């Protein structure tokens, strides 16, 4: 059946699409639609190289922009 | 049901028209030079449609016409050049660094098109007319007084390969800058443009052909 990709699919409001879960593999937890990217910070060059950041490294890291994992959060809440 | 086919494609035509109107606004210099920042990612696509993928913005300068051609009739989107690091095919030739009055990208280059082609990371000049995305993502790139430079091919392959690490990590795609929330494009016409596209999309799915 006939298919078509919205020119608005990369913009923030695409998250309010009713089929959003269906067309983006990651769903709300997909990094592609994360609300946590600071557009003026630089991603860590050490992280991308795969080498260990120095202590206190203040580049933007992937952990900064990745949503919390509900398994860790359901964990913390108990006890 | 031929009346209903004609409606479906009428909608698609209207959405295509409004889509090029929208792209023009976001490519316009007064709306995007603020965000043409060294290290920000940029999706480069030629007017004819060859897709060079994502690259790293290195520099951007105002375009200057040739001596013999004072008024070259450039549009606003053809009046600025962004120097972008792109992954070219090893097949692709030498990167001439200045564009002629009639070119949007250099003449002898092409994107990577074969597997077991690693590519070659080169800095390529592009008109704003070839910008089809700005990312929220910024890589770190050397600058004046940082002691590095993108003239070193080895630095280009170092930065280049991190951009492929970013794309590997972004399974669902590199995240775009939002024209409203990130670029704060105030134009009332642009505001209406995005709503016009949405209501037309609602019209288009209402049509049997969508799932036929
Ligand atoms: Zn780091």
Residue numbers in the entry:
A (entry chain B): 1014 to 1092
B (entry chain A): 654 to 865
Publication excerpt:
The eleven-subunit MTREC comprises the zinc-finger protein Red1 and the Mtr4 homologue Mtl1.
Therefore, we switched to the Chaetomium thermophilum (ct) Mtr4–Red1 complex (homologues of spMtl1/spMtr4 and spRed1) due to superior biochemical properties of proteins and complexes from this thermophilic eukaryote. With these data at hand, we also succeeded in determining the structure of a complex comprising co-expressed (but not fused; split chain complex) ctMtr4SA and ctRed1pep, albeit at a lower resolution of 2.75 Å. Comparison of this structure with the single-chain structure revealed only small differences, as indicated by the low RMSD of 1.08 Å for Cα atoms of 273 residues, thus validating the single-chain structure. Notably, in our structure Red1 binds to both the KOW domain and stalk helices of the helicase. Importantly, in contrast to all previously characterized, canonical ligands Red1 utilizes a large interface that extends to the stalk helices and fixes them with respect to the KOW domain by inserting a U-shaped element that serves like a wedge. This extended binding interface observed for Red1 is supported by an extensive network of hydrophobic interactions and hydrogen bonds.
